[PDB]
Amino acid sequence: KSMRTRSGHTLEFKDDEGGDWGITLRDINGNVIHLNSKDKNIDITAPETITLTAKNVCINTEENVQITAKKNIDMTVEADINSSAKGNLLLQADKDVLTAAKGNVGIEAKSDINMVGKNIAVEGNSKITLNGGQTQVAGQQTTIQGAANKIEI
Amino acid sequence: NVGIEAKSDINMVGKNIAVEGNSKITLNGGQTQVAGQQTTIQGAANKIEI
């Protein structure tokens, strides 16, 4: 059961419960909104762009949420950004992972903190503080420098 | 736990860097360098300077 105009705009109902059962609203250029009753799905397809503009946007799911792109993903905000998890929080990249702040950077973690790398460089400008319970440094050739002279171990 | 793992380099740049370990702080790896202008190592009462 359908309703069509002369340009090709369509609103269609399909009653075949053994396949192709649902509602469709589309045009000939390739914009589709499909309500699928056999599978209980909703599909929205646009050849170029899909825009969601409102005052608030809420996504509620009882399982996974997946976002996939062939290019960048951007998130620009004029206030805070918050991310909370009850498990792990993975930040994995194949080239680099850079974190720049115009103010402080705070890494506060109860229990353990681990850092592993080929080379580690710490570059201070005013002071470098290493306060702890027990301090131990290793290495096959450890050198303590500063000002005129130096100590070689 | 918190893990910062890299396979090429790790570079930290900041005005002040402060590390406060409640129990233990350990540094490992060959060719360790500590530099600056004034370097102090303390303990119970010992205090040496460079």
Partner: peptide, 5 residues
């Protein structure tokens, strides 16, 4: 130089 405790 090296000012010990």
């Amino acid at each position: 130089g090296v000012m010990v405790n």
